[PDB]
Every structure is written in structure tokens, then in C-alpha cells.
Amino acid sequence: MRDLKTYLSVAPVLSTLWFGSLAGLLIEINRLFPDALTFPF
């Protein structure tokens, strides 16, 4: 549906999806590599 796809492009829904994916990625990254203080490579 075109009208359903239009509602998914509104600012709050897109922001929520983007930030949820971002937070998931950051949480997983910190889970894999915990307690990082310096860049060792």
C-alpha cells in the first residue's frame, strides 16, 4: 500500500527505527569488546 509506505517515512517512525538499530549495534559491539579505554591497534 502506497499510503502505508508513506506513513513509514514520517519523521518519528523513521527516527525510532534508526535509533533502535543504532542502539542494538552499539550494545552488541560493547558486548563483544567490553571495557575499552584505549585503541590498541
Partner 1 sequence: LVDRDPIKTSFEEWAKPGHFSRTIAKGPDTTTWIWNLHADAHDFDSHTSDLEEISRKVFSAHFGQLSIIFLWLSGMYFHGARFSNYEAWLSDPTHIGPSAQVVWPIVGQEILNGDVGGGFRGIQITSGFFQIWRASGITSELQLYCTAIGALVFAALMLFAGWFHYHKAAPKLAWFQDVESMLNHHLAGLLGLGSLSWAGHQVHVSLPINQFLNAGVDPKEIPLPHEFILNRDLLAQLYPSFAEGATPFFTLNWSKYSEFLTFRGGLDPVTGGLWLTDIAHHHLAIAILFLIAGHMYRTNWGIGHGIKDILEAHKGPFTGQGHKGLYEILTTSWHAQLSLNLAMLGSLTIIVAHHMYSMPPYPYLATDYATQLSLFTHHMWIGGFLIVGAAAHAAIFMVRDYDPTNRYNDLLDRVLRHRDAIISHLNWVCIFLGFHSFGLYIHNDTMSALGRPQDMFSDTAIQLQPVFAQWIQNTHALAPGVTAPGETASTSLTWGGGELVAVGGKVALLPIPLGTADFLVHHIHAFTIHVTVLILLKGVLFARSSRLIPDKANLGFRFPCDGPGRGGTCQVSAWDHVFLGLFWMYNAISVVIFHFSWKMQSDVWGSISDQGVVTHITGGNFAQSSITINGWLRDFLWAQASQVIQSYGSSLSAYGLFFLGAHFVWAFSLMFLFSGRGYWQELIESIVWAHNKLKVAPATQPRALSIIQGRAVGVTHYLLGGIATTWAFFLARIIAV
Partner 2 sequence: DISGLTPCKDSKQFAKREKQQIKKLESSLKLYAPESAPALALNAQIEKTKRRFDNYGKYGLLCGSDGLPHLIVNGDQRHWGEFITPGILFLYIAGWIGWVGRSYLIAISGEKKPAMKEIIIDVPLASRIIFRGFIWPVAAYREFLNGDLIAK
Query: What's the angle, vertex CA 20, arms to CA 34 and CA 5, rounded to 5?
Result: 155
Minimal distance in Å, beta carbon 8 to ligand CLA?
A: 15
Does residue 34 contact residue 27 with C-beta atoms inside 8 Å?
Answer: no
Q: Which of 15, 16, 21, 30 binds partner 1 (CB under 8 A)?
A: 30
The 8-27 site mask, x for binding partner 2 (CB under 8 A), equals -xxx--x-------------
- For position 3 contacting partner 2 by CB under 8 A, the verdict is no
Q: Does 25 bind partner 1 (CB under 8 A)?
A: no
Torsion, Cα 15 17 23 25, to 10 degrees, reads -130
